[PDB]
Amino acid sequence: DISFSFEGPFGKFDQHQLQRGLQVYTEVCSACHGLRYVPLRTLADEGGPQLPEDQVRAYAANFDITDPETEEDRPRVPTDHFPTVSGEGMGPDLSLMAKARIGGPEYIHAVLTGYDGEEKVLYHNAAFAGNWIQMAAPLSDDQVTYEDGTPATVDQMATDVAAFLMWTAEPKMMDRKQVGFVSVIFLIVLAALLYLTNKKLWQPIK
């Protein structure tokens, strides 16, 4: 039960953390895990890492894609999805993990952080299958340098990419919390006026 900027009804992603997490993703997770349902351009949007266009464009450019219409590769562009990853020794796509496992980002963090050392080619894990995951503990310290100081400790890294993963799952979380706020407040007002109206319609009869 660690916590994040975003649980609760007034929660919001933390942009920086989200970028830290994107970076952990890029530099570590993406070798074994894809994100098919995430279009690269969304990295740009209000409510997420919100990198700026030219960075998102630069970032997109490090990924390869076999052009359907053609048949040559080209570097990726913002309209493409992150790559789909798979084959042998390759993990479940992660675009929805935070929602698929409600305790989502905690489970990702629990798992990344839950290797003891054992090896029955399985590996003991506090949080998985109970308790042998086939994913060799993927993170060790300062395995990433954040342009932003933050000590790249394993716990940190697991946390950032958990937040980041939460956002690939619910990109519209902020929108959805905001609209929800206005709907509820609006219905509460409405409920109230129908309440009075209704009361006034009824006092003469009671």
């Binding site: 349902y37 929805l96 619910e170 519209k172 609209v179 706020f181 129908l194 319609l201 009824w202 009869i205």
Partner: protein
């Protein structure tokens, strides 16, 4: 029928229009039906259901505009709805929780009925049309649930199409026919999509026949004492026009319900579903924790309760020379569970209408109710005893109640003293 004052045209237009299509007379006799004035907050779940019907359809038509029913594109298409469509996520979450509000409301609705004698003469037809709608809602809901083609959609689809294959003799054929081949696959996805679109229209039709029926008999009320038809001055004492009085009581209640609904939709959009449908149907693996949709949980519970171990199952397996095994029994028991509820007007032989005035009833009825929640609950717990025992007790109570308890009280029970008119009740 209840003395009521009928529509009279004045305007030039209304006179013109009345001669050629008296559509305003129709509207008027509907919004002005005389309603018992003593109705309580239980009477509001009908308007909430109507609301849900109109909400599932509206959001549905509009989701179909961005959804693709192909096994290679279904799941991606829901993801594209969530991410790229204006207000996509919100409509998606509305339609989904929407289904849950729908069932929340029918169960309540229904239970009001079972308590207040709204199925007893002369309201049997209203009830039976109610039960059709109910069957239809369940079928409708299952198919929609296949649509995202997640792990739950797929194994859910296998399992429920499996129910038909249990029928001795003709079951493999009905199964092959529903599937469209030897296994849940694209043909399955593709036909459930059609039917998901169609069925909600059939449901709307039945609902028209539903409202029509209760307008014919008149609404019931907490006392079970019919509006007086002796004259207009009497009936007026017992009733009020549906409009403005209950339209507004109703709209207010709905508003309070929608306050929670949107709270959930805004902040807990996924707490009422299974995470696991965020994983893509995999035809090689059924997921270890596979729990049906909550509104299906009691009937599901009734289903697994019936393993080979169970004595009624071995007795019947034996008497039946093997034709009814635990597999068929459990299915029969499940649709049986639904059917015996359908038949309640001919089982509840007590001549008193409302449960209010039945003192042995109030007990068996709450037990019933508890039973239903407890069953929902177990369905979500592992087989592994002591839950099977709790599931079996539960079912046996369910049939016991309609098959034994209700006919018994026909003879046993003694009505407490009723008020003589609705207007009586109201003044208290």
């Amino acid at each position: 029928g209840i003395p009521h004052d009928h529509y009279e045209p004045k305007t030039g237009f209304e006179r013109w229009l009345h001669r050629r299509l008296p559509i305003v007379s129709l509207v008027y006799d509907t919004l002005m039906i005389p309603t018992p004035k003593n109705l309580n907050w239980w009477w509001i779940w009908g308007i909430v259901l109507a609301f849900c019907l109109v909400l599932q359809i509206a959001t549905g038509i509009v989701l179909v505009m961005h959804y693709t029913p192909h096994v290679d594109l279904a799941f991606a298409s829901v993801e594209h709805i969530m991410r790229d469509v204006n207000g996509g996520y919100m409509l998606r979450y509305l339609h989904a929780n929407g289904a849950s509000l729908f069932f929340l409301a029918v169960y309540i609705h229904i239970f009001r009925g079972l308590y207040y004698g709204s199925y007893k003469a002369p309201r049997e037809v209203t009830w039976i049309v109610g039960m059709l709608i109910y069957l239809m809602m369940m079928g409708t809901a299952f198919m929609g649930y296949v649509l995202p083609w997640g792990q739950m959609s797929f194994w859910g689809a296998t399992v429920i199409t499996g129910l038909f294959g249990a029928i001795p003799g003709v079951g493999e054929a009905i199964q092959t026919w529903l599937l469209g081949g030897p296994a849940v696959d694209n043909p399955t996805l593709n036909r459930f999509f059609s039917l998901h679109y169609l069925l909600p229209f059939v449901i709307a039709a039945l609902v028209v026949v539903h409202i029509w029926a209760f307008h014919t008999t008149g609404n019931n009320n907490p006392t079970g004492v019919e509006v007086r038809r002796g004259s207009k001055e009497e009936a007026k004492k017992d009733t009020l026009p549906f409009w403005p009085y209950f339209v507004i009581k109703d709209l207010f209640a709905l508003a309070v319900v929608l306050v929670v609904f949107f709270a959930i939709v805004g902040f807990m959009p996924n707490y009422l579903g299974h995470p696991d449908n965020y994983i893509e149907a995999n035809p090689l693996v059924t997921p270890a924790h596979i729990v049906p949709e909550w509104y299906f949980l009691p009937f599901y519970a009734i289903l697994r309760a019936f393993t080979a171990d169970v004595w009624v199952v071995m007795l019947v397996n034996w008497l039946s020379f093997g034709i009814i095994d635990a597999k068929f029994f459990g299915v029969i028991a499940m649709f049986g569970a639904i059917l015996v509820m359908a038949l309640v007007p001919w089982l509840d032989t007590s001549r008193v209408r409302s449960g209010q005035y039945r003192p042995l009833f109030k007990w068996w009825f709450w037990l019933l109710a508890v039973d239903f929640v407890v069953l929902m609950w177990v369905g979500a717990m592992p087989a592994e005893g002591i839950y099977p025992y709790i599931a079996l007790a539960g079912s046996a109570y369910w049939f016991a109640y309609f098959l034994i308890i209700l006919p018994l009280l026909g003879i046993i029970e003694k009505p407490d003293a009723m008020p003589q008119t609705i207007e009586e009740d109201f003044n208290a």
